[PDB]
Amino acid sequence: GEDAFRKLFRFYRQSRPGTADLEGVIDFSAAGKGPGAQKVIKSQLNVSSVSEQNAYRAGLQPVSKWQAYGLKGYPGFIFIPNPFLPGYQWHWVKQCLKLYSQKPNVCNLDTQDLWEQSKEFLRYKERSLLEKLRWVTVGYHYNWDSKKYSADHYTPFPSDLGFLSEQVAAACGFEDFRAEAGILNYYRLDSTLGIHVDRSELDHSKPLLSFSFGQSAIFLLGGLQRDEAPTAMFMHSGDIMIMSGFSRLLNHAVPRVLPNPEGEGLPHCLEAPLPAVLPRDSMVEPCSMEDWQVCASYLKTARVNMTVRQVL
Ligand SMILES: [Mn+2]
């Protein structure tokens, strides 16, 4: 475009993956990028706020093994790399495609059953309801015209997703966090998310939690005004971003979902299977081969985002 954010947004939208174009983008998984990488600082977690039993029940590594980062100049911003136990990302992806999208919740659409159809479309050699799915709301449903939440329009918040969110929130120092409203977003390789501020509600003290699965994205985090040059960072599969306080007023964008380097394929962390024998006390359940096959085929050219907040 013209201004600093616009220039960087367009740069990354059009960049060539694999080349020196992405040398300035922060990769939190890899701990010499110039401005970007010098801003990276450790963000101290409240390790004792999440018991090993609770981490294991959510399908998470023990919090003592998590690495959390902040960025100098962006107070209230926390970036976790993938903390998920091997295999467990598949549970969340399955729940987002199969269960959470169903009509007890609201979705952009609202066989002929979505999951049964995609089961059959995979078998029928070479536009499905799953391919058309763009967003789903859970918990207190957001009204897109009303621009707010209401006690009349709600569904019980998925207890597995709520518990996961609250463990993450607790590790970040928000031990009283209540998962009450969620938006699930479904992106394609061509998907872009424009520069915006998440709309202002009086209290900004509670964290927004953002989970990503599937293909990697480039996220731009800017300033209070649109003109300030953003910092660029990767969001890889399993990574979690937490924004509270000051950071919730910042301009941000996702200019690019990056393809798998081989065109179509899955990130390395999704190669591990969900374990055969899960615990009895787990919030997670087994994933069937048939269900998995639909998830894998979908994720090869997609990114799923879950955004969780407290509204009351
Ligand atoms: Mn946003």
UniProtKB/Swiss-Prot annotation:
Changing residue 300 to A: Does not affect DNA lyase activity. Fe cation binds at residues 196, 198, 252. Belongs to the alkB family. It comes from Homo sapiens. Changing residue 65 to A: Does not affect DNA lyase activity. Changing residue 94 to A: Does not affect DNA lyase activity. This is Nucleic acid dioxygenase ALKBH1. Signal peptide: none annotated. Changing residue 183 to L: Reduces Fe2OG dioxygenase activity by 50%. Substrate binds at residues 115, 140-142, 198. Its cofactor is Fe(2+). It is found in: Nucleus; Mitochondrion. Changing residue 98 to A: Does not affect DNA lyase activity. Ubiquitous. Residues 64-312 are annotated as: tRNA-binding. Changing residue 303 to A: Reduced Fe2OG dioxygenase activity. Abolishes ability to mediate oxidation of mt-tRNA(Met) methylated at cytosine(34) to form 5-formylcytosine (f(5)c). One of its GO terms (molecular function) is class I DNA-(apurinic or apyrimidinic site) endonuclease activity. It catalyses: 2'-deoxyribonucleotide-(2'-deoxyribose 5'-phosphate)-2'-deoxyribonucleotide-DNA = a 3'-end 2'-deoxyribonucleotide-(2,3-dehydro-2,3-deoxyribose 5'-phosphate)-DNA + a 5'-end 5'-phospho-2'-deoxyribonucleoside-DNA + H(+); a methylated nucleobase within DNA + 2-oxoglutarate + O2 = a nucleobase within DNA + formaldehyde + succinate + CO2; an N(6)-methyl-2'-deoxyadenosine in DNA + 2-oxoglutarate + O2 = a 2'-deoxyadenosine in DNA + formaldehyde + succinate + CO2; an N(1)-methyladenosine in tRNA + 2-oxoglutarate + O2 = an adenosine in tRNA + formaldehyde + succinate + CO2. Changing residue 269 to A: Does not affect DNA lyase activity. Its EC number is 1.14.11.-, 1.14.11.51, 4.2.99.18, 1.14.11.33. Changing residue 96 to A: Does not affect DNA lyase activity. Dioxygenase that acts on nucleic acids, such as DNA and tRNA. Requires molecular oxygen, alpha-ketoglutarate and iron. A number of activities have been described for this dioxygenase, but recent results suggest that it mainly acts on tRNAs and mediates their demethylation or oxidation depending on the context and subcellular compartment. Mainly acts as a tRNA demethylase by removing N(1)-methyladenine from various tRNAs, with a preference for N(1)-methyladenine at position 58 (m1A58) present on a stem loop structure of tRNAs. It comes from the Eukaryota.
